[PDB]
Short mmCIF file of C-alpha atoms (C1' of nucleotides) in Angstrom, two decimals:
data_model
loop_
_atom_site.label_atom_id
_atom_site.label_comp_id
_atom_site.label_asym_id
_atom_site.label_seq_id
_atom_site.Cartn_x
_atom_site.Cartn_y
_atom_site.Cartn_z
CA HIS A 1 -44.46 21.55 47.49
CA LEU A 2 -46.80 23.57 49.79
CA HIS A 3 -44.20 24.36 52.45
CA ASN A 4 -42.07 26.19 49.89
CA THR A 5 -40.33 29.08 51.62
CA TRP A 6 -39.04 32.40 50.35
CA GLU A 7 -35.54 32.31 51.84
CA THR A 8 -32.23 34.22 51.68
CA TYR A 9 -28.60 33.01 51.85
CA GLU A 10 -28.17 34.64 55.29
CA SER A 11 -31.54 33.15 56.31
CA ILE A 12 -30.50 29.55 55.41
CA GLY A 13 -27.12 29.21 57.20
CA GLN A 14 -25.70 25.87 56.13
CA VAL A 15 -28.07 23.01 55.05
CA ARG A 16 -27.74 20.29 52.51
CA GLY A 17 -28.38 21.27 48.89
CA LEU A 18 -26.57 24.63 49.01
CA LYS A 19 -24.69 23.63 45.85
CA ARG A 20 -28.11 23.29 44.06
CA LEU A 21 -28.95 26.88 45.13
CA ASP A 22 -25.53 28.08 43.96
CA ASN A 23 -26.04 26.36 40.58
CA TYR A 24 -29.52 27.86 40.29
CA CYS A 25 -28.32 31.38 41.13
CA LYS A 26 -25.19 31.21 38.96
CA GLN A 27 -26.74 29.63 35.78
CA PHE A 28 -30.14 31.39 35.77
CA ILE A 29 -29.09 34.90 37.04
CA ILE A 30 -25.85 35.03 34.93
CA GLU A 31 -27.48 33.75 31.71
CA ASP A 32 -30.64 35.78 32.16
CA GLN A 33 -28.81 39.08 32.70
CA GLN A 34 -26.44 38.15 29.82
CA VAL A 35 -29.27 37.60 27.41
CA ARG A 36 -31.06 40.77 28.74
CA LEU A 37 -27.94 42.99 28.47
CA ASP A 38 -26.46 41.74 25.19
CA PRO A 39 -26.95 43.91 22.06
CA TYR A 40 -27.14 41.02 19.61
CA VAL A 41 -30.18 39.41 21.20
CA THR A 42 -33.29 39.63 19.03
CA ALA A 43 -36.85 39.91 20.21
CA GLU A 44 -37.59 36.28 19.19
CA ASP A 45 -34.92 34.93 21.59
CA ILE A 46 -36.15 37.09 24.44
CA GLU A 47 -39.76 35.99 23.86
CA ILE A 48 -38.90 32.30 23.68
CA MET A 49 -36.82 32.53 26.88
CA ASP A 50 -39.73 34.37 28.57
"C1'" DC B 1 42.79 -6.95 51.75
"C1'" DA B 2 42.99 -1.98 52.46
"C1'" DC B 3 41.23 2.56 51.41
"C1'" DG B 4 38.05 5.94 50.04
"C1'" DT B 5 34.15 8.02 48.25
"C1'" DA B 6 29.73 7.79 45.85
"C1'" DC B 7 25.35 6.59 46.28
"C1'" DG B 8 21.25 4.22 48.66
"C1'" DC B 9 18.48 5.46 52.20
"C1'" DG B 10 16.31 8.16 55.78
"C1'" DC B 11 14.26 12.62 57.00
"C1'" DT B 12 11.85 17.03 56.03
"C1'" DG B 13 9.35 20.47 53.42
"C1'" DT B 14 6.08 21.80 49.80
"C1'" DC B 15 2.95 22.05 46.54
"C1'" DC B 16 0.07 19.90 43.39
"C1'" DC B 17 -2.77 16.90 41.64
"C1'" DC B 18 -5.78 13.19 42.40
"C1'" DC B 19 -9.64 11.53 45.29
"C1'" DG B 20 -14.12 12.01 47.41
"C1'" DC B 21 -18.62 13.91 46.98
"C1'" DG B 22 -22.50 16.27 45.12
"C1'" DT B 23 -25.07 17.64 40.88
"C1'" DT B 24 -26.41 17.44 36.10
"C1'" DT B 25 -26.35 15.28 31.66
"C1'" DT B 26 -26.35 11.49 28.42
"C1'" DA B 27 -25.90 7.67 26.12
"C1'" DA B 28 -26.00 2.44 27.03
"C1'" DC B 29 -29.46 -0.88 27.08
"C1'" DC B 30 -33.62 -3.12 26.06
"C1'" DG B 31 -37.25 -3.56 23.08
"C1'" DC B 32 -38.85 -2.44 18.17
"C1'" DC B 33 -39.34 -2.22 12.74
"C1'" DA B 34 -37.91 -2.86 7.41
"C1'" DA B 35 -35.90 -5.29 3.90
"C1'" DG B 36 -31.93 -7.58 2.14
"C1'" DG B 37 -27.49 -9.95 1.87
"C1'" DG B 38 -23.88 -13.53 4.04
"C1'" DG B 39 -23.19 -17.70 5.45
"C1'" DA B 40 -23.82 -22.56 7.38
"C1'" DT B 41 -25.80 -26.99 6.21
"C1'" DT B 42 -27.62 -30.88 2.58
"C1'" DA B 43 -27.55 -32.87 -1.80
"C1'" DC B 44 -25.80 -33.31 -6.34
"C1'" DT B 45 -22.70 -33.08 -10.60
"C1'" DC B 46 -18.37 -32.67 -13.00
"C1'" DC B 47 -13.50 -32.14 -14.03
"C1'" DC B 48 -8.91 -30.95 -13.07
"C1'" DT B 49 -5.10 -32.05 -10.68
"C1'" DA B 50 -2.21 -34.34 -7.58
"C1'" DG B 51 -0.89 -39.14 -5.94
"C1'" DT B 52 1.33 -43.28 -7.82
"C1'" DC B 53 4.24 -45.86 -10.77
"C1'" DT B 54 8.27 -46.62 -13.97
"C1'" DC B 55 12.42 -45.10 -15.95
"C1'" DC B 56 16.26 -42.18 -16.65
"C1'" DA B 57 19.64 -38.46 -16.22
"C1'" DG B 58 21.99 -34.67 -14.22
"C1'" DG B 59 22.65 -32.01 -9.66
"C1'" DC B 60 25.00 -32.46 -5.54
"C1'" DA B 61 28.64 -34.10 -2.83
"C1'" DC B 62 33.44 -35.63 -2.54
"C1'" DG B 63 37.88 -35.84 -4.00
"C1'" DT B 64 41.77 -34.09 -6.43
"C1'" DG B 65 44.95 -31.38 -9.72
"C1'" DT B 66 45.90 -26.88 -11.11
"C1'" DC B 67 46.03 -21.83 -11.24
"C1'" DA B 68 46.22 -16.91 -10.49
"C1'" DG B 69 46.75 -13.54 -6.73
"C1'" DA B 70 49.18 -12.58 -2.21
"C1'" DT B 71 53.55 -13.31 0.55
"C1'" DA B 72 58.42 -14.07 1.43
"C1'" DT B 73 63.22 -14.06 -0.09
"C1'" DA B 74 67.81 -13.39 -3.85
"C1'" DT B 75 70.60 -10.40 -6.03
"C1'" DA B 76 71.85 -5.81 -8.18
"C1'" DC B 77 71.99 -0.39 -8.45
"C1'" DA B 78 72.07 3.97 -5.71
"C1'" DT B 79 73.81 6.25 -1.46
"C1'" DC B 80 75.72 7.73 3.63
"C1'" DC B 81 80.01 7.96 6.69
#
DNA sequence: CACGTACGCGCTGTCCCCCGCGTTTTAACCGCCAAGGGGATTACTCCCTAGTCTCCAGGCACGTGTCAGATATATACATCC
């Protein structure tokens, strides 16, 4: 946990655990921009997710 | 036994759905109360009811005579050539 690297999809290539990165990107980015861009999301929901 | 033709089987394509693998969840499992009821035994008491016995009588089985419905003729009236 000290050799953690700031990487990119083109900077990785093909290593084991790419499905974990895909699940991370899909779930977190899609749900975070969905809860950010929705009009029915209150301030309480946005502060508990933050 | 002869004929003939329909179908079992082999081959090929194709597409689809199940299998293998990785990742994430989730509930099975084990260990815990908290009290209470169900049920397996041990012992005891009581009483109802089914076995046992005796005697008898009618239900069942067999046999036989009849009897009413179904079937097959006997004779008479109507009818075609």
